[PDB]
Amino acid sequence: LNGTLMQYFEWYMPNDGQHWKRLQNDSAYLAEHGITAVWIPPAYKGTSQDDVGYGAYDLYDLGEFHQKGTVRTKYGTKGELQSAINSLHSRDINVYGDVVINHKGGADATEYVTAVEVDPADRNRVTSGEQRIKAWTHFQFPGRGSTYSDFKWYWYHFDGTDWDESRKLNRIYKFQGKAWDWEVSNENGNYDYLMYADIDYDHPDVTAEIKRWGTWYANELQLDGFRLDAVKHIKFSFLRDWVNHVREKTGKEMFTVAEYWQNDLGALENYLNKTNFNHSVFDVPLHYQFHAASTQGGGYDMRKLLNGTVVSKHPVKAVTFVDNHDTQPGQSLESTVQTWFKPLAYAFILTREAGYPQIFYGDMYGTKGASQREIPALKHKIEPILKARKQYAYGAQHDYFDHHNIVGWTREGDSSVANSGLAALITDGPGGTKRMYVGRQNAGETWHDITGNRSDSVVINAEGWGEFHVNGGSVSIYVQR
Numbered sequence: 460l461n462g463t464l465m466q467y468f469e470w471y472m473p474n475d476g477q478h479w480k481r482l483q484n485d486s487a488y489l490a491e492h493g494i495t496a497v498w499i500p501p502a503y504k505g506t507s508q509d510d511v512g513y514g515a516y517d518l519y520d521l522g523e524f525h526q527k528g529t530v531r532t533k534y535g536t537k538g539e540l541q542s543a544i545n546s547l548h549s550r551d552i553n554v555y556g557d558v559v560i561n562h563k564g565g566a567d568a569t570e571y572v573t574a575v576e577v578d579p580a581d582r583n584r585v586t587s588g589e590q591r592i593k594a595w596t597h598f599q600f601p602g603r604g605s606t607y608s609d610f611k612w613y614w615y616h617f618d619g620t621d622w623d624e625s626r627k628l629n630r631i632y633k634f635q636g637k638a639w640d641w642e643v644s645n646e647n648g649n650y651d652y653l654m655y656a657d658i659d660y661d662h663p664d665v666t667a668e669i670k671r672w673g674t675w676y677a678n679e680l681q682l683d684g685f686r687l688d689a690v691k692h693i694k695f696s697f698l699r700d701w702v703n704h705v706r707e708k709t710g711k712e713m714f715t716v717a718e719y720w721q722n723d724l725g726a727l728e729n730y731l732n733k734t735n736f737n738h739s740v741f742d743v744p745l746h747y748q749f750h751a752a753s754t755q756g757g758g759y760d761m762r763k764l765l766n767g768t769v770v771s772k773h774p775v776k777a778v779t780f781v782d783n784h785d786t787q788p789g790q791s792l793e794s795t796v797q798t799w800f801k802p803l804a805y806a807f808i809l810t811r812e813a814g815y816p817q818i819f820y821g822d823m824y825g826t827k828g829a830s831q832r833e834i835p836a837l838k839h840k841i842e843p844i845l846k847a848r849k850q851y852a853y854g855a856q857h858d859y860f861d862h863h864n865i866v867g868w869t870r871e872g873d874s875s876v877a878n879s880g881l882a883a884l885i886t887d888g889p890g891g892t893k894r895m896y897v898g899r900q901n902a903g904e905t906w907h908d909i910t911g912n913r914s915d916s917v918v919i920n921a922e923g924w925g926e927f928h929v930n931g932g933s934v935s936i937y938v939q940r
């Protein structure tokens with residue numbers, strides 16, 4: 460009954476074209492462990508076969524056409540993806556497709572374009588006169604032709620680019636007659652520009668096309684929802700309208716979560732407000748608190764976890780997580796939650812009542828970068844916590860964030876889930892004990908730590924209290940034997 464998301468990729472997976480098959484073969488395991496939705500990496504052709512998917516060369520090529528030196532994407536063919544999705548749907552697992560619509564990379568040809576340079580720290584400030592550049596802006600899709608869509612892209616569908624091919628120079632160029640879109644993040648004055656060729660969401664043909672592609676993509680992969688990439692760089696009213704449009708055309712709920720990357724509740728609340736709360740956001744501040752706690756050796760005040768997060772103020776609109784493909788070691792938003800703390804963070808998102816929690820493929824199975832800082836496979840430490848969510852994390856919650864290190868919470872259980880109820884403790888410092896209330900309805904039950912970290916049983920007293928233990932730097936989740 461509790462919903463659990465899984466991000467089903469990490470940055471450094473091998474480029475062997477087997478990922479979709481792997482996903483298909485993992486669907487039984489996912490369903491058995493209580494995963495109810497998966498966020499899949501971008502499924503369309505990037506700038507090369509080894510593109511993780513954020514290059515977004517051709518949104519209508521789901522590993523179906525020979526373009527950029529390959530038919531398959533990094534992950535496999537369209538048919539393989541569709542077979543994975545029908546296996547997941549057979550076990551009632553929803554599929555959320557990644558939507559990369561900020562930009563297009565890997566244009567087929569250059570165009571001569573008049574542009575001005577802008578200040579990378581303040582993109583409202585122009586720093587040159589008009590100059591002629593060669594920008595990678597012409598998309599003809601030679602391998603696809605007009606199959607599924609005859610829409611071709613040219614420079615006038617974009618606001619700018621970061622590369623002049625004639626001078627071989629990396630600068631932010633704004634094209635003649637274009638304006639950065641608004642509303643976007645006010646970072647760097649205006650953060651419309653991120654990378655590759657930036658889509659002009661002032662252009663009416665572009666807005667129409669991206670909306671109609673959205674519907675096509677949903678049908679083609681029978682998607683149940685979306686993950687929106689890089690939303691702080693995309694006109695907010697457009698994203699709002701795009702989500703409404705696809706819901707209207709498909710007739711489905713289409714759960715949507717947006718990646719608005721800022722460690723600031725205020726900015727995320729502005730985004731929610733400007734999109735009329737029609738979709739969720741990832742709980743980026745909560746991630747940064749996990750990272751902080753994990754790197755401060757007990758010095759962090761664990762009471763802080765209850766404030767300044769999306770889930771603390773808008774729980775229905777928060778997707779909580781520990782790490783992702785951008786925060787993992789080596790990546791562009793690196794802020795990895797250290798290994799020792801990771802299970803405590805998973806207990807916080809998985810066993811508490813608020814928020815839609817998401818598990819990271821990289822945490823389950825490890826990351827496969829070339830460093831010696833990779834996340835190790837933590838599947839066996841996460842599995843018990845997933846089981847706690849699936850079977851035990853129901854009913855009224857009681858919080859005990861009354862200590863700098865040792866904090867906890869209980870769930871009373873619900874009569875609709877037999878034997879449900881839990882008592883969780885985490886500590887970023889020394890271990891110890893805490894008496895917590897689990898409900899008089901659980902009086903006399905004998906509870907045990909589902910993680911196996913503590914071997915002691917706890918008998919709930921007549922008044923509904925148990926004396927629970929946790930080891931140093933550890934997590935324990937007690938549930939009924």
Ligand SMILES: OC[C@H]1O[C@H](O[C@H]2[C@H](O)[C@@H](O)[C@@H](O)O[C@@H]2CO)[C@H](O)[C@@H](O)[C@@H]1O
Pocket residue numbers: 461462463464495496553712714774775776814815
């Ligand atoms: O996991 C499948 C489940 O996901 C969504 O439910 C979310 C809900 O939208 C959020 O507001 C939040 O409270 O968490 C829920 C999952 O625990 C879909 O809305 C729902 O239809 C779907 O079954």
Ligand SMILES: [Ca+2]
Pocket residue numbers: 561562650651652653657658692693694
């Ligand atoms: Ca943009």
Ligand SMILES: [Ca+2]
Pocket residue numbers: 618637638639640658659660661662
């Ligand atoms: Ca524009």
Ligand code: NA
Pocket residue numbers: 617618639640651652657658659660
């Ligand atoms: Na733009």
Ligand code: NA
Pocket residue numbers: 757758759760761863864887888
């Ligand atoms: Na602490």
